[PDB]
Amino acid sequence: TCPFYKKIPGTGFTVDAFQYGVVEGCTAYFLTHFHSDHYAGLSKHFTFPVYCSEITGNLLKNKLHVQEQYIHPLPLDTECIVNGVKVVLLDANHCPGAVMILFYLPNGTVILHTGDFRADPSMERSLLADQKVHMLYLDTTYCSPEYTFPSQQEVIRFAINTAFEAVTLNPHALVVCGTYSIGKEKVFLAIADVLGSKVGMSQEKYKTLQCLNIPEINSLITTDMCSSLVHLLPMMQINFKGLQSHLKKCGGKYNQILAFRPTGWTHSNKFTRIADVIPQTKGNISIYGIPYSEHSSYLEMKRFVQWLKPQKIIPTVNVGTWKSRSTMEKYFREWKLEAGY
Numbered sequence: 001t002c003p004f005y006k007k008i009p010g011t012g013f014t015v016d017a018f019q020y021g022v023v024e025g026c027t028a029y030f031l032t033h034f035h036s037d038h039y040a041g042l043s044k045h046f047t048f049p050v051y052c053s054e055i056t057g058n059l060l061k062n063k064l065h066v067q068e069q070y071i072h073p074l075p076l077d078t079e080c081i082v083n084g085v086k087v088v089l090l091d092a093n094h095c096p097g098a099v100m101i102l103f104y105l106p107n108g109t110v111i112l113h114t115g116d117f118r119a120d121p122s123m124e125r126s127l128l129a130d131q132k133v134h135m136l137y138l139d140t141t142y143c144s145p146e147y148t149f150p151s152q153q154e155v156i157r158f159a160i161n162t163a164f165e166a167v168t169l170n171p172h173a174l175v176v177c178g179t180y181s182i183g184k185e186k187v188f189l190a191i192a193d194v195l196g197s198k199v200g201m202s203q204e205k206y207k208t209l210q211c212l213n214i215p216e217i218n219s220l221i222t223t224d225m226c227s228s229l230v231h232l233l234p235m236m237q238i239n240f241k242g243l244q245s246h247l248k249k250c251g252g253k254y255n256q257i258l259a260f261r262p263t264g265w266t267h268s269n270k271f272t273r274i275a276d277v278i279p280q281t282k283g284n285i286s287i288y289g290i291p292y293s294e295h296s297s298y299l300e301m302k303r304f305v306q307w308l309k310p311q312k313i314i315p316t317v318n319v320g321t322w323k324s325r326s327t328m329e330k331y332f333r334e335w336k337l338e339a340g341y
C-alpha cells in the first residue's frame with residue numbers, strides 16, 4: 001500500500017509511487033527522476049497522467065515505451081497549474097532531469113518535495129527564496145555526521161590527472177568506467193575529454209545518453225569500441241575477473257586496464273583525503289573507488305534545512321527502522337535549536 005511519505009496532502013497527488021498499482025484517489029503521478037527505485041512500475045501499459053521534466057519524459061518514452069499522451073513534461077523554474085494546483089519544478093543537482101517539486105496548496109500551505117538531491121548554496125537563490133515552506137519531504141540518504149565527502153569538482157580533478165598520467169606513461173593502457181543508471185556522466189566524459197577520445201559503450205547505454213539533451217554529445221560518445229580508449233561497462237563487470245575478461249576481448253590493442261568505480265560513500269572517507277586514495281591492483285589491472293556523490297553530505301543537508309527553516313520535516317529515506325527514524329528526528333531538533341527557528 002502506498003506509504004504516507006509519497007502522498008501530497010490536500011491534493012490528489014503522489015510522488016514516485018508507481019509500484020503500488022492504482023493508488024486510490026490519485027489524480028496525478030509525479031516522477032522526480034529516472035532511477036529504478038523511483039520509476040518501478042511504469043511501462044507502456046500505464047494509462048494515468050505522469051508529470052516530470054522534459055529529460056525524464058524523453059526517457060519514459062524511449063526506454064520504457066510509455067505512451068506520449070500520458071507524459072506531461074514541464075519546464076523548470078516556471079509556475080504551472082496541474083489539476084488546479086500551482087506547481088514549480090526546480091533543479092535537484094542529482095542525475096540528468098532530476099527535479100524538486102514545489103506545491104502551492106489552495107489553503108495557503110507550501111510543500112517542497114526534494115526528490116533525490118545534493119543540496120547546494122545555489123539553491124538559496126532560486127524561486128525558493130521567494131516564500132516560506134511549511135512542510136519539507138527530505139532526501140535523508142546520508143543524514144548522519146559520519147557522512148562527509150569532497151566536492152564533485154575535487155573528485156573529477158583527481159580522476160582526470162590520474163587517467164592523463166597513466167595513459168601518457170603507457171599509451172597502450174585502456175581506461176574503463178563503471179555505470180548502472182543515469183548520473184555521474186561527468187566522470188567518464190571529463191576523462192575522455194582530457195585524453196582526446198570518445199567514450200565507447202553498448203547500444204542500449206548510447207541510446208539512454210542520447211535522451212538527455214547533453215550539448216555536443218554526438219562529439220563525446222560512440223558505440224564504436226575500437227576507436228575509443230575510454231570504455232563504459234556495467235558496474236557489475238568492474239572487478240578483476242570482469243576486467244581480465246574484457247581485456248581479452250580487445251585483441252592485444254591494450255596491455256593494461258585502469259578502472260574507476262564511482263561509489264556513493266565508503267568508510268575510507270572518515271580517514272582518507274581525496275589526495276590519499278589508492279587503487280586495488282592485481283596483475284596489470286588497477287581499480288579506484290572514488291567518492292563521487294549525487295546526494296547531500298550531512299553538512300550540506302544541515303545547511304539547506306537551517307536556511308529554509310521548514311515547520312515540519314518528513315524524511316523519505318532510511319525510514320524502515322525505528323532506530324533510524326529516531327536518530328534523524330534528534331538531528332532535526334538539534335538543527336532547529338541551533339538556528340533558532
Ligand code: NI
Binds near residue numbers: 033035094116
Ligand atoms: Ni536517485
